[PDB]
Design a protein around this motif. Structure first.
Motif, PDB file in Angstrom:
ATOM      1  N   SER A  39      -4.835  -4.128  -3.080  1.00  0.00           N
ATOM      2  CA  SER A  39      -3.684  -3.235  -3.040  1.00  0.00           C
ATOM      3  C   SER A  39      -3.437  -2.495  -4.345  1.00  0.00           C
ATOM      4  N   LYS A  56      -4.451  -8.417  -0.155  1.00  0.00           N
ATOM      5  CA  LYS A  56      -3.408  -8.185  -1.148  1.00  0.00           C
ATOM      6  C   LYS A  56      -3.991  -7.778  -2.492  1.00  0.00           C
ATOM      7  N   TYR A  86       0.824  -1.206   0.000  1.00  0.00           N
ATOM      8  CA  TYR A  86       0.000   0.000   0.000  1.00  0.00           C
ATOM      9  C   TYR A  86       0.861   1.260   0.000  1.00  0.00           C
TER      10      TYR A  86
END
Lengths: 49, 44
Positions: free
Chosen positions: B19, B16, A2
């Motif tokens: 993301s 994930k 991120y």
């Protein structure tokens, strides 16, 4: 993941700001050289007559 | 907890996949909030 995506996206924004700043300088430098050229070709035509 | 541990894999997959604010995020947003013609008909 991120953090890198955020940082990479921020860097992409920086590149857009940078290319845009740079692009405007390139356009600016070319325009200035065009003014000098016209001025010269003019003075040159006069001095030939 | 003792019943199973296969749920943690699903949590990890979602964390994930979210993301990538590119194709994956746009797809999940469109699905959760609401040949390409065949895909639209199949999605509906």
């Amino acid at each position: 993941l991120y953090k890198n995506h955020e940082l990479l996206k921020l860097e992409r924004k920086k590149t857009e700001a940078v290319a845009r700043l740079k692009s405007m300088n390139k356009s600016a430098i070319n325009q200035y050289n065009r003014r000098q050229d016209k001025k010269n070709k003019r003075l040159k035509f006069g001095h030939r007559l | 907890l003792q019943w199973g541990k296969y749920q943690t894999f699903g949590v990890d997959i979602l964390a994930k996949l979210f993301s990538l604010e590119k194709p994956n995020l746009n797809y999940f947003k469109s699905i959760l909030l609401n040949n390409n013609h065949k895909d639209k008909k199949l999605l509906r």
